[PDB]
């Protein structure tokens, strides 16, 4: 069913993802694009892109909401061993040769990778966990969003 999920290996939490419209969405580095178990069921990788660091299971990428480039957002962080919590922030910007990407200066354990970032309507505007380490050792994550074809 729709919601946010932990991704576990047997146990260790290696990441997080979003179930929406029957498709499971996570970051590629969480699963390395391998199949997942859900209860007694198997979720097979359907679409992915290592450069975007994204993968979807059971169908194509469904998350199409975009950061408006202006407003505060919320990370719905699901850290290992802790319940989901919402953290509001005003994104900064990754400026790249191919354009600007919103980025959040929020630092969580590696197994928080795949946690969704939300707009004020609760729509998922991207996933947390592909980023850079800045000079002082803190972290900035892109707001990584796929394309709904």
């Amino acid at each position: 069913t729709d919601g946010v999920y932990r991704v576990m290996t047997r146990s260790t939490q290696v990441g997080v993802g979003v179930m929406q419209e029957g498709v499971f969405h996570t970051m590629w580095h969480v699963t390395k694009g391998a199949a997942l178990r859900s209860g007694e069921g198997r979720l097979d990788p359907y679409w992915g892109d290592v450069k975007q660091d994204l993968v979807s299971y059971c169908g194509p990428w469904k998350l199409d909401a975009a950061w408006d480039g202006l407003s505060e957002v919320q990370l719905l962080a699901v850290p290992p061993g802790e319940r989901a919590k919402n953290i509001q922030t005003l994104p900064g910007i990754f400026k790249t040769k191919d354009g600007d990407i919103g980025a959040v200066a929020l630092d969580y354990p590696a197994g928080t990778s795949g946690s969704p970032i939300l707009d004020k309507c609760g729509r998922v505007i991207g996933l947390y966990g592909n980023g850079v380490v800045i000079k002082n050792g803190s972290y900035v994550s892109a707001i990584t969003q796929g394309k709904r074809e």
Partner: protein, 38 residues
Amino acid sequence: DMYIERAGDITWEKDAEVTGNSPRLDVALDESGDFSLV
């Protein structure tokens, strides 16, 4: 064995804790999906 477990509903929280700055960074993205500072 890599498996998933439900962890909650996806809902914006009213009157939430606000933290973090808004850094403006020049970055590059390689073909393997790694970001780096320029």
